[PDB]
């Protein structure tokens, strides 16, 4: 396709804004590192303590 | 349109201070910062520092510590930069630019760690020379191909800039106004020239219109071949 | 401070050409590298942010690449609006630093200058100084040597040159050399000549004016 | 109706900042965000996000990782090499987000306590810790007095005699 | 006119005999003294991590070839891939280690300063007030020997309690 992507997998291109990747261990280019996890959530806020009555 | 509008040009004697302001519009001024960048004439860009519109925190380049103070005013959406103890090499066009999102966590591709938009620029001239209006001398014409070349010599003015046109803007083809040069006297000098058909010299009138806003001086000068 | 090195310093190309500018950091900056385009006389404008992102207005013929230490900017099909100066800039660490810039100019065929010489005006002469102007008009390329001869005395240190930017319509340059003398010294000699050498001229062209004589 | 601090809960009504002040005085009740300590926590989280992608992983020609035929020894080694790599990186990723999230929770908890202690220092002997994240200020503190506390210009000697008399 | 100021947003370039210390101002003048126990307590922790980063011995002998003068293909692609994988993983470990270490070192040295302040706060009890800048206003006359008793932890608050409370209220 007519687009821009530094990283290529046999499944197609993927972005590289995330440090890790779960699409395919076969990659070409500037790619995220392949891991077995499907999701890893990094906290970007504090503990959520909803308020009292 | 997101926009930064800066204050007017300044001419300052050495040892003085200058304060330049940037007025923001089109975006949330308190959720970003302002970076200041200057450019000496014919030179590259130099970063002076940064101030947050959210916190008022500041980052100054080590070269300017103790000489710069940056301030921000939320209600007027205006950032200010003050440079103290000015020297001759502080002469530059000073730019402000919106920089760095504040008040929220940002991923790198959305951090706004880039300068956009920019102000139009503020020229600050620091010289121990005083404002002076230019003297306008003609360069009379006299042929080849056959075209003649005539122009005006705009000399001994301070500070930049001067505006030059021909026949009140009616003549624009073939015009070449040269960039000013700083003479050893501390004053600026400039030439504007134009090529015209050699046949039209007797019939057509050529006047260069010179404007020096800093001194409010305005001069029309008729250019004609010398009489012999 | 982190140092940014741009290559090449200057570049000349044609419309429709493909060009690539290079920026290099002295230490890793991640992808926090931005590119600015500055047209002569205008404020810089953001072109690429975070290494590879086009500012939303931006033309698709510009593209950026790189990370860490090495970065590039590519214009796939050059257009007239693209000829300007390009600065790379690092936003990873304070103090933010700029590259020295890459000037992009239009390639052209060689054109010899038309040479004109101008005697000092009477109005200026009576005041006490004399400025003699040598004009080199519509030439390419920029490299040119101007020499001042007064009664065949080769002068140095009393002349200042000044060049225009490339002309928008014909891509040529124009140059002005001004010889400044006191009224007294302008009266000692009769003939003044500026000698122009240029690669568009096989033999150098000399233009002379006889003083007190038109 | 009565206000309470961070010891008990958080504030869903606070949307202009991450940390802030609520007060109740003679003129009424009000709320204000503390921007410096809000941005101090955000600056650190932004720094994490920058450091997690700071190193570029750029690989081109590698080994083959899928195979259409049974070959034996060499293919056994090629598969073992790639599986070993993935397990080590999968471990690195799991430990990274765990360490980072623990630190994010810690640093945001710390910014709250630093703003509480900063306020405790200002008030000196003119207030007492109610134990719920609030201070009982023992003197008439109008809106201008509250704002002096929030912007760090509150002079305790002005209200000291009044506050000491109400405390004892 | 130089008034003393404490560690809140302020370091001491003048203190060279220790890492943490006291500065005082009383009737006899101004003075300075380093606190040796807390200085060494922070140093001992840095020494301990210096010992631990170097404790493992990495001793390798015959290994694999890592530079090749000829193009060979499959087997050489694998040897290069193994070594490149090992280097990237150790490079990651080295980067993460010094990051965790420095964060902890900054925290533990910040903690020692807070411990020393709280240790002093407990000594003074109701005889002083927190000035907010890292200093205590001692509300009684405290000569040089009285300052040293605070510095060496033998300060008895009951001796001065009546005088201090009378000055406070
Ligand atoms: C990518 O393709 C592979 C097979 O080639 C498959 O196992 C995997 O599930 C695919 N992943 C995605 C995200 O499509
Ligand atoms: C949540 O985090 C993402 C990325 O870290 C950010 O883009 C987004 O603005 C955050 N949401 C809020 C409500 O701040
Ligand atoms: C702090 O708030 C008080 C009360 O509103 C005001 O008088 C003072 O000028 C403020 N100071 C600053 C630095 O904003
Ligand atoms: C502590 O200092 C006081 C005052 O100088 C002194 O009398 C006492 O002996 C000291 N104690 C120790 C254990 O150094």
């Amino acid at each position: 396709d007519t687009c821009i992507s530094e990283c290529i997998t046999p499944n197609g291109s993927i972005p590289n804004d995330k440090p890790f990747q779960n699409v395919n261990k076969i990659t070409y280019g500037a790619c995220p590192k392949y891991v077995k996890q499907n999701t890893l959530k990094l906290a970007t806020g504090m503990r959520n303590v909803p308020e009292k009555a | 349109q997101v926009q930064l509008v800066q204050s007017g040009p300044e001419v300052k004697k050495p040892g003085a201070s200058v304060k330049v302001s940037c007025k923001a519009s089109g975006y949330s001024f308190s959720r970003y910062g302002i970076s200041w960048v200057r450019q000496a004439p014919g030179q590259g860009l130099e970063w002076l520092g940064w101030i947050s519109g959210y916190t008022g925190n500041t980052n100054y380049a080590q070269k300017f510590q103790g000489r710069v103070t940056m301030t921000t005013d939320t209600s007027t959406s205006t950032a200010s930069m003050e440079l103290r103890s000015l020297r001759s090499d502080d002469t530059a066009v000073y730019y402000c630019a919106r920089d760095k999102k504040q008040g929220e966590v940002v991923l790198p591709a959305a951090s706004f760690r880039w300068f956009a938009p920019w102000g139009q620029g503020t020229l600050v001239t620091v010289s121990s020379a005083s404002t002076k209006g230019p003297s306008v001398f003609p360069l009379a014409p006299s042929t080849s191909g056959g075209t003649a070349a005539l122009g005006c010599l705009v000399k001994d003015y301070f500070p930049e800039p001067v505006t030059v046109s021909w026949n009140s803007g009616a003549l624009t083809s073939g015009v070449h106004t040269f960039p000013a040069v700083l003479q050893s006297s501390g004053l600026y000098s400039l030439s504007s020239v134009v090529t015209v058909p050699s046949s039209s010299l007797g019939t057509q009138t050529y006047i260069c219109n010179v404007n020096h806003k800093p001194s409010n001086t305005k001069v029309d000068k008729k250019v004609e071949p010398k009489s012999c | 401070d982190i140092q940014m090195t741009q290559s090449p310093v200057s570049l000349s190309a044609s419309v429709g050409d493909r060009v690539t500018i290079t920026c290099r950091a002295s230490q890793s900056i991640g992808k926090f590298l931005n590119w600015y385009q500055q047209k002569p006389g205008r404020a810089p404008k953001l072109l690429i942010y975070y290494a590879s992102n086009l500012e939303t207005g931006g033309p698709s013929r510009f593209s950026g690449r790189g990370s860490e230490t090495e970065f590039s900017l590519t214009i796939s099909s050059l257009q007239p609006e693209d000829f300007a100066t390009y600065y790379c800039q690092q936003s990873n660490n304070v103090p933010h630093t700029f590259g020295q810039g890459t000037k992009l100019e239009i390639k052209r065929t060689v054109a010899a200058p038309s040479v004109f010489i101008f005697p000092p005006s009477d109005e200026q002469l009576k005041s006490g100084t004399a400025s003699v102007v040598c004009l080199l008009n519509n030439f390419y390329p920029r490299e040119a040597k101007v020499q001042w001869k007064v009664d065949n005395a080769l002068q140095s240190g009393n002349s200042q040159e000044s060049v225009t930017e490339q002309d928008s319509k014909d891509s040529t340059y124009s140059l002005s050399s001004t010889l400044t003398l006191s009224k007294a010294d302008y009266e000692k000699h009769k003939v003044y000549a500026c000698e122009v050498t240029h690669q568009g001229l096989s033999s150098p062209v000399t233009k002379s004016f006889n003083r007190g004589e038109c | 109706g009565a206000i309470a601090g961070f010891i008990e809960n958080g504030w869903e009504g606070m949307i202009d900042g991450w940390y802030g002040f609520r007060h109740q005085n003679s003129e009424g009740t009000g709320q204000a965000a503390d921007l410096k300590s809000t941005q101090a926590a955000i600056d650190q989280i932004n720094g994490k996000l920058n450091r997690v992608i700071e190193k570029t992983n750029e690989k081109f020609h590698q080994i083959e990782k899928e195979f259409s035929e049974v070959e034996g020894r060499i293919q056994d080694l090629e598969k073992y090499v790639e599986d070993t790599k993935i397990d080590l990186w999968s471990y690195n990723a799991e430990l990274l987000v765990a360490l980072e999230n623990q630190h994010t929770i810690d640093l945001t908890d710390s910014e709250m306590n630093k703003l509480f202690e900063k306020t405790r220092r200002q008030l000196r002997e003119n207030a007492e810790d109610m134990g719920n994240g609030c201070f009982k200020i023992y003197h008439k503190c109008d809106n201008a007095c509250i704002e002096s506390i929030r912007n760090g210009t509150y002079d305790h000697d002005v209200y000291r005699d009044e506050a000491l008399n109400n405390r004892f």
Side-chain angles (χ1 to χ4, degrees), chain D residues 82-93:
Chain D
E82 180 65 16
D83 198 52
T84 302
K85 172 187 185 182
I86 297 165
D87 287 353
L88 288 163
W89 278 113
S90 294
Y91 176 89
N92 286 338

Side-chain angles (χ1 to χ4, degrees), chain B residues 138-141 150-151 201 204-206 221-227:
Chain B
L139 296 162
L150 61 100
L201 286 147
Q204 242 293 348
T205 336
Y206 293 118
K221 211 55 197 297
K222 213 217 187 189
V223 192
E224 59 197 347
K226 196 173 198 177
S227 60

